[PDB]
Each structure stands twice: as structure tokens, then as C-alpha cells.
């Protein structure tokens, strides 16, 4: 009949409504979809102003129903014809689906829902939860909303049971070398830490494993009582009503951080100074686009004719566009009357608003521009550079100029490349302030939900997004430890993600190092390092001090290793047996495509996914020392020669199905504890920069591949470097390096034409490093024959070469003669007869292989043009002597 549900559930929902905080329910069982309408109606009975919209995120198929109205009513009518249903009867679940406004979304298509806000969210499938999807949905849930997770899987239920009976115990049944849901286990453990989480069954009985089990109903709120942030909003709105006409826009601002940023922007526009720069860094959901829309409206009110806005793509910018539109409406501008919208003629922009024209008063234009384009910026009054962190850094450096700059950056964004490139852009901002004046404003107050939201706090703790690097006072007092004193340790991933608080703090430090090190990140990287069998984690520690007394150590370097080769093939076969193969090897496939080589399929190697060193420590050599220790560990020097030592498998006790029918591992392990497999090589795949290339050159890696076209986000080409371990043949590496050298000499013509000659010679030297390290001296460049010379060069061309050697001719004749000669010199088939300087060889490569103009080469070298011409004349004089 009627069963009185537990008093914690309505208390939790009404507390969330009163405090504008979100809540999370985990419904376990088959009737979770039957219990959803009760939760939604409790939401709506608590709050009438609450948003009605429901979001349904599912992986593959809907849980027991369909979303098509005609299909549903046809099935109902056929059931009426059979007679199994009364003519007017509805399951409350069916009425819920029929009446309520539900947006159905796949897990893969979580990008579409980013702008929208939803009253309720329903994650149907737990086992496929990814951090990116989780963050994307929970950001859409408004304050007071409910995030429901449906647990309908028996395996997940048994994992939950075993885990709550024993936190130490884990349920991994019938699991070979494969994916292990360590992230899901950490999720389930963190649900007990969450204060606004209830775990209930299909009969709405509260399971006491939740964090909210000691919840109490709040006292009823007073209408006179208001939150202090809203009180400061009232004060700022009173000041706005005193002001005019920007006061309406300030009232339109939803947070005091928005109001302060808006007032700083308005002060900048009132100054109207070209040397002034305002840099706004915001969290996600903090209305940075709202602040910039008020900025554009305020500039229009001041009477700004030229508004240039740039972004990597206008799909980052439509939000700014409607925010600008409602700022225009608040000022008094109306569509088709005083402003007109010209959308994108380009189909790739999906009819995005590219041109905004304003007719009243003087002509005003708000136009979207390409970030790489900067020559049109000569007549720029105000420019908003949105997602300048996502914009590549040299593009930003070129983009800086004498015009009003409003920079937009996303600190602590869900995409970690946003916050890492935000840190690098903060460094570039500190460079920029050193000339043009700069003022920095930050936003951390959410508009959708209350500040200090428990769900947001739990999500940030779980995904390690808000991890920030902090200098170590103990390490500062003890001084920088010596790299030879430092040592390498393997991190056991199970106890790393066992959610013990010490391991949580350690993981926070490693994630802080990871993000602060590399400028490219994603939340799925955490699930990747947790749940991939091939991946291993290494940490470089300072030497252990007795004064620490068992305190948590602070990492110096972080190494991520992915095992790619023949050892991964047995796991790939298991993945093919169990459906999908989730991208095992990258370097073997790339080498197989670039080079037809059957032996590389047999060879097994390790790829360094990321090296991470602390930015505060500069030129410590910790990364190079870590690479040397890793190479020694894979060679076997740290490994004990005696095999009499026990393997000592520190895997956590895995509960079986028969065990259900019927002490933590060490966080850090010495290198001698585990013996690595027989690995043949090390590889790295990274965006080509001068510092990183120098670092890997000092680590003695040899390049075998450079990607033809650079990545759009980074702007740097992908380079692959290999290093053969000792005791393994390097003939294949030497052949690969030689063919890559020839390919690079050819490819300097097209898409490498923008490289500097110094970096080009650096690449050539790194390629020649393999030939230098090769023990066999049989292979050598063949000397250029006289018949070959007469074939590749005309005799009267040689006469012209001698004439310009005697300086009779000009440059414009010898320009034909240059490029083939440079190819000969950098192929070194001409021999060791003529040795050129480094600067002279840079000039020769720049003219010949890169097809660069001498004015540009002189500008790059910071040398006089006549001096460069004389140096080239000396080069070709040596050439003419050699011929």
C-alpha cells in the first residue's frame, strides 16, 4: 500500500532547494527508472520556480523504453486492441516521459549540451562514466537540482557490496589483463565522502553507506533573510541605479565578481587608452562571456566604431554573441532596426554570426577575425581575444599591439589544456606588463549554483581539477637535492586510486605537477592512467630524510609509460575477443606506415606519455636524471641479478564470485622490487619546440618522424624520437634516421619553411646522432663522381659558378644554382673536403632548402645583409674550389 519513505530524502532535496545547492542520488536496482518521477516531483513540490528540464545521458540504448512519441502511442494503441491495457491508464513513468521536457543525449555527444542548463540530470549507465562526461553534465545541472546515477548492473552492485563491507577488498572477477575500473571504484568510495549524496535502492530505502545519512531538515527560511553575496549584489545594484547608463548592465551581472570585472572593463573603455590591457581569467560557469558582452555593450555606448573579436572558432563565441545581444537590448538596440546580423558565408562555421553592424549614431562594426590574421588589426580600436590560452602562444605574441586588449582565459577549466595554457599565458602576461599596462581580474563565483557547492567540491576533488602546485618549505629549507641523490620509484596504481587520504594528497601533488608541466591536458587522462593495463607510473623522489619521520614526500618528476609492441599484442587479442580494441600502440603503427618494416612489429618498446618536472625548479637536471634512471631500470641495472627473490605481487586481494557466495599495498615501490619485461626501445611523441628538442637530444633520443602539418591547437609539429636500449641492434634505428634525414631535407621546402635554420640544423644533428652512435663504420656517404656532377650540373652552369666565385655575375643568376648545391652539402656526398661554419651552414640551408629571402635570413641572424652576402660568397667560393 503506502509506505512512508525515509525522512532523509525529502530533507535532502528541500535543503538543496533552500541553500541553492545540488544533490546527487544513486538508485540501485531495476526500478530506478520507476523511482525517477518521485524525485522529480519532490524537486518541483519543493520549488515552483525550479527549472523543469530533464537531461538523460545514456551510452547505447534507452533503459526499457523509447523516445519516439508516435512509436509509444502506436504500441499503446496496439495494446488497447489486444486488450491488455485499459483505455485510459498510464504508468507514472510513462506519464513522466510523455509530459516532461527531456533532452536525450549520448555519452559521446556531450559537447552539444554545454550551453544548456537543466533542472535534473540522469546518468543511465554507470560503467561507462568518463570524467569529461561527468563534468559536462554536472556543470549543466542548476542549483537545487538532482543528479541521479542508475546502478542496474549486477557486477557494479557486487563491487559496491564488497567494497562497503571491506574498503580494502575489491571485486575483480573473471578479469585477465584488461581494463580495471579503478576510477569507478574511487568514484564509489568518494560518494561516501560527499555530503549531498544518497544511495538508495529501487524501493527508496536509504543505504547507510552514503555521506548524507546524518542529514537533518533545515529550518524554514526567512523571506527577509538573503545570502550575503546577494546582499552585496543589492548594494552594487544600488550603486548601478545611481550610475547611468551602465547601471542596467551592472544589474544584469549576476555575481559581484562579474560586477567588479565589468567595472574594470568600463574603466578601461573610459580611459580609451591603447596601451591598456585587461586580462580576465575565469572558472567555467562564471560568466566571463557575460562580462565581455557587457564590455562590448559598454564600448558601443562609449561610441567605439571598431570592435575585433578573435577566437579559435566561433562556437566558442556564440555565447558571447547572445550576451552582447542582450547588452544591446538593455542599452536600447534592436534587431532589424538599429543593428543587423550578417552570418557566416563559410559553411564550416555553421552560419555563425561573423558581422554585427550598428546603424544608429556613427557606423559601428563588431567583427569576428581569424587569430593568425593580424595585418587587418592596424585599424583596431577594441579587440577581445577570447580563449587566448587556446590560441597558440606565438600567435598571441604577434597579436599584441597598440589597441585596447581584453583577454579571456579559462583558469581551472574542465579541459586541462585550458588551465595549463592559462598558467603559461599568465607568465606571458607578466612578460607583457613589463611597456603596456595590464590589469588582471579573476572570476570564481558560479551563477548557476551557490558558492561552496558540495557537488562541485566533490567533483573537483575527484577529478583533481583544482589541484594547484605549491612550493615545499621543507625542500626549500633543506635546499635543492642533488639529482644523483634523487631516486626513482614505481607507483602502485591500485593503492594510488584506493582513495586513502594519504594517497589522495600524493595524487594531488602528481596531478599538479602533470598539469603545471604540460600545456595539453584532458580529464580523460586520469581515467587513462588509472584503467589502462599497459600504463605504468614512475616518480622521482628526493633522498629520504629521517627528519621527515614518515611524512608525505613531494614528487620532483613524474613519468608515464605506455607499453607498445609485441607484449601488447596478447592484450589486443583479448580486447578483440571482448569487442573493441582501445588504441594499443601508436609508435609501432606510425613506424609501420612511414617505413615498411616487419621487424618493428616484432620489436617491443615503451613510449613516454608525459615527463613532468616542477616549473619552480629551473635547470635542476631532474628530468634528465629521471630519464637516465628509467633507461637503467629498463636495461636491468637496478634489477637484482638473483632470481631467488620472491616476486611479491602487491595486487589487492580480489574477491571472487565464489568468495561472495561463501593491509593495503605500498604506495611507492623500489625499482628492484619489480623486474621489467624485455623492452627494445624507448620512444617519445611530442610537439616540436626548441627546449624540448634540446632536452631529448641531451637524453640522446634520435628523431625518426616529424609530422607534416602542425596541430591546430598547439601550432607545433609532432615529432617522434626513439632510443635503443643496450644489447639491442641499432641498425634499424640508423636506417630510420638516415631516411628521416633525407625526408627532412626534402620537406624543408614546404611546411617546414617557417622553422628557423638553427632549429633545422638542430634536427639534422639529432638525426646524425644515430650515425655517430653507430658502431659500424662500413656505411658512409659515397663521394660525388665527376660523371654524376656533369649529370646534375651543366658545364656552363659550373662556368657561371666560377664566374660568381670571381664575383663577375650577380645573385639573381646564382639563385638557380643554390638549392641543388645545398642538398648536396647537407647530404654530405661531396665529402669532408669543405667544412662550413654553423652560421654559414644556416645561411645555406635557409636559402636553399627553406627557400627563404636573404633579407629575412639577415633579420633572423641579426646580421648585416652585406655581411651575409659576403659570407655566402665565401661559401660558394669554397664550393667552386671543391668543384
Amino acid at each position: 500500500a503506502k509506505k512512508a519513505i525515509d525522512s532523509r530524502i525529502p530533507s535532502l532535496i528541500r535543503n538543496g532547494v533552500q541553500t541553492k545547492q545540488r544533490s546527487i542520488f544513486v538508485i540501485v536496482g531495476d526500478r530506478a527508472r520507476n523511482q525517477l518521477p518521485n524525485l522529480h516531483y519532490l524537486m518541483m513540490s519543493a520549488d515552483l520556480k525550479m527549472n523543469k528540464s530533464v537531461l538523460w545521458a545514456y551510452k547505447k540504448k534507452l533503459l526499457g523504453f523509447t523516445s519516439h512519441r508516435k512509436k509509444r502511442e502506436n504500441k499503446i494503441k496496439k495494446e488497447i486492441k489486444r486488450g491488455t491495457r485499459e483505455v485510459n491508464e498510464m504508468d507514472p513513468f510513462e506519464s513522466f516521459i510523455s509530459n516532461q521536457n527531456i533532452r536525450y543525449v549520448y555519452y559521446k555527444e556531450s559537447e552539444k549540451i554545454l550551453g544548456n542548463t537543466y533542472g535534473m540530470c540522469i546518468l543511465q549507465d554507470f560503467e561507462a562514466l568518463t570524467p569529461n562526461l561527468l563534468a559536462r553534465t554536472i556543470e549543466t545541472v542548476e542549483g537545487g537540482g538532482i543528479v541521479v546515477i542508475l546502478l542496474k548492473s549486477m557486477s557494479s552492485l557486487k563491487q559496491l557490496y564488497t567494497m562497503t563491507m571491506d574498503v580494502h577488498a575489491r571485486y575483480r572477477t573473471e578479469a585477465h589483463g584488461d581494463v580495471v575500473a579503478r576510477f569507478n571504484e574511487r568514484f564509489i568510495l568518494s560518494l561516501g565522502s560527499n555530503p549531498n549524496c544518497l544511495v538508495v535502492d529501487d524501493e527508496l530505502n536509504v543505504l547507510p553507506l552514503s555521506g548524507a545519512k546524518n542529514v537533518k531538515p533545515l529550518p524554514p527560511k526567512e523571506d527577509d533573510e538573503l545570502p550575503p553575496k546577494q546582499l552585496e549584489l543589492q548594494e552594487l545594484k544600488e550603486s548601478l541605479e545611481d550610475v547611468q547608463p551602465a547601471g542596467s548592465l551592472v544589474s544584469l551581472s549576476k555575481t559581484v565578481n562579474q560586477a567588479h570585472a565589468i567595472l574594470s572593463f568600463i574603466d578601461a573603455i573610459s580611459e580609451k587608452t591603447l596601451n591598456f590591457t585587461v586580462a580576465l581569467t575565469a572558472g567555467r560557469g562564471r560568466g566571463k562571456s557575460a562580462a565581455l558582452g557587457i564590455s562590448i555593450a559598454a564600448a558601443v555606448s562609449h561610441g567605439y566604431s571598431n570592435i575585433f573579436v578573435t577566437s579559435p572558432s566561433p562556437e566558442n563565441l556564440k555565447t558571447l554573441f547572445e550576451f552582447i545581444f542582450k547588452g544591446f537590448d538593455a542599452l536600447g538596440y534592436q534587431e532589424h532596426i538599429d543593428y543587423d546580423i550578417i552570418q557566416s558565408t563559410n559553411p564550416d562555421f555553421n552560419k555563425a554570426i561573423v558581422r554585427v553592424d550598428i546603424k544608429r549614431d556613427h557606423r559601428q562594426t563588431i567583427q569576428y577575425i581569424v587569430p593568425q590574421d593580424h595585418q587587418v588589426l592596424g585599424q583596431a580600436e577594441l579587440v577581445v581575444i577570447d580563449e587566448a590560452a587556446a590560441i597558440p602562444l606565438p600567435i598571441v605574441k604577434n597579436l599584441l599591439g597598440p589597441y585596447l586588449v581584453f583577454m579571456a582565459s579559462t583558469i581551472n577549466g574542465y579541459e586541462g589544456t585550458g588551465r595549463s595554457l592559462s598558467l603559461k599565458l599568465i607568465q606571458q602576461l607578466r612578460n607583457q606588463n613589463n611597456s603596456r599596462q595590464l590589469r588582471e581580474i579573476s572570476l570564481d563565483e558560479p551563477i548557476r549554483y551557490a558558492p561552496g557547492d558540495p557537488i562541485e567540491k566533490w567533483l573537483n576533488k575527484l577529478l583533481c581539477l583544482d589541484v594547484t602546485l605549491i612550493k615545499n618549505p621543507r625542500f626549500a629549507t633543506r635546499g635543492t637535492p642533488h639529482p644523483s641523490q634523487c631516486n626513482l620509484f614505481v607507483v602502485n596504481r591500485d593503492t594510488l586510486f584506493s582513495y586513502h587520504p594519504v594517497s589522495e594528497n600524493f595524487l594531488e601533488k602528481m596531478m599538479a605537477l602533470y598539469v603545471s608541466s604540460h600545456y595539453k591536458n584532458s580529464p580523460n587522462d586520469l581515467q587513462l592512467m588509472s584503467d589502462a593495463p599497459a600504463h605504468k607510473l614512475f616518480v622521482l623522489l628526493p633522498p629520504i630524510d629521517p627528519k621527515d619521520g614518515g611524512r608525505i614526500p613531494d614528487p620532483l618528476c613524474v613519468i608515464q609509460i605506455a607499453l607498445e609492441g609485441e607484449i601488447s599484442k596478447e592484450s589486443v587479442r583479448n580486447s578483440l575477443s571482448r569487442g573493441q580494441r582501445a588504441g594499443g600502440d601508436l609508435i609501432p603503427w606510425l613506424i609501420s606506415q612511414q617505413f615498411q618494416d616487419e621487424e618493428f612489429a616484432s620489436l617491443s618498446g615503451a613510449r613516454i606519455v608525459r615527463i613532468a618536472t616542477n616549473p619552480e625548479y629551473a635547470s635542476m637536471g631532474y628530468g634528465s636524471r629521471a630519464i637516465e634512471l628509467l633507461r637503467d631500470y629498463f636495461e636491468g641495472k637496478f634489477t637484482d641479478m638473483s632470481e631467488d627473490v620472491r616476486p611479491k605481487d602487491y595486487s589487492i586481494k580480489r574477491v571472487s564470485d565464489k568468495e561472495l557466495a561463501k593491509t593495503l599495498p605500498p604506495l611507492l615501490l623500489k625499482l628492484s622490487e619489480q623486474p621489467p619485461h624485455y623492452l627494445h626501445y624507448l620512444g617519445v611523441s611530442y610537439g616540436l619546440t626548441q627546449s624540448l628538442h634540446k632536452f631529448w637530444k641531451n637524453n640522446s633520443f634520435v628523431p625518426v618522424y616529424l609530422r607534416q602539418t602542425a596541430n591546430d591547437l598547439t601550432g607545433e609539429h609532432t615529432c617522434v624520437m626513439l632510443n635503443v636500449l643496450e644489447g639491442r641492434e641499432s641498425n634499424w634505428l640508423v636506417e630510420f634516421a638516415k631516411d628521416f634525414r633525407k625526408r627532412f631535407l626534402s620537406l624543408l621546402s614546404y611546411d617546414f619553411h617557417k622553422f628557423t635554420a638553427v632549429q633545422a640544423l638542430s634536427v639534422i644533428e639529432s638525426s646524425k646522432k644515430a650515425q655517430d652512435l653507430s658502431d659500424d663504420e662500413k656505411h658512409d656517404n659515397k663521394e660525388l663522381t665527376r660523371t654524376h656532377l656533369d649529370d646534375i650540373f651543366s658545364p656552363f652552369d659550373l662556368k657561371r659558378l666560377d664566374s660568381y666565385s670571381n664575383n663577375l655575375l650577380d645573385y639573381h643568376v646564382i639563385g638557380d644554382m643554390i638549392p641543388m648545391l645545398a642538398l648536396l652539402y647537407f647530404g654530405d656526398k661531396m665529402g669532408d673536403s669543405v667544412k662550413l661554419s654553423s652560421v654559414q651552414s644556416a645561411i645555406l640551408l635557409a636559402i636553399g632548402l627553406q627557400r627563404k629571402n636573404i633579407d629575412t635570413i639577415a633579420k633572423e641572424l641579426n646580421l648585416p645583409s652585406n655581411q651575409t652576402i659576403a659570407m655566402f660568397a665565401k661559401i660558394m667560393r669554397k664550393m667552386s674550389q671543391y668543384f
Binding site: 540501485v28 535502492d201 547507510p208 623500489k670
Partner: protein
């Protein structure tokens, strides 16, 4: 109809009444019978930093 029953939910004062409508059921009953919390179990459970070292129950 807020005073009346709509669907299964019925609200009287602050209380909500909702109609109801093997091994897994047994382990759910075990979960209901369990009163200890996983955070307090984490408080009991200690962690070893290294292979041979002092196990710490809580962070310093």
C-alpha cells in the same frame, strides 16, 4: 493536486508516502543492515608509504 495523491506520492506535513509498486536481494539487505560508513572505515584503514615503512592511518 498538491494536497491529493498524484501518481504515488502523497504529502502530509513534512512526510512523503510513496506506493511500493535472490543473492542480489540478500546482499541489498546486508547493505541495509550495515551501519558503518566507508569514510570511518577509511579512518581505520592505514597506508604504507614504502615497501618497509611506518604505516600511517591519517595524513599529518
Amino acid at each position: 493536486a498538491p494536497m491529493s495523491d498524484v501518481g504515488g506520492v502523497l504529502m502530509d506535513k513534512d512526510a512523503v508516502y510513496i506506493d511500493i509498486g535472490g543473492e542480489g536481494e540478500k546482499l541489498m539487505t546486508g547493505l541495509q543492515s550495515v551501519e558503518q560508513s566507508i569514510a570511518e572505515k577509511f579512518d581505520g584503514v592505514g597506508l604504507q608509504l614504502f615497501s618497509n615503512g611506518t604505516e600511517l592511518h591519517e595524513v599529518a
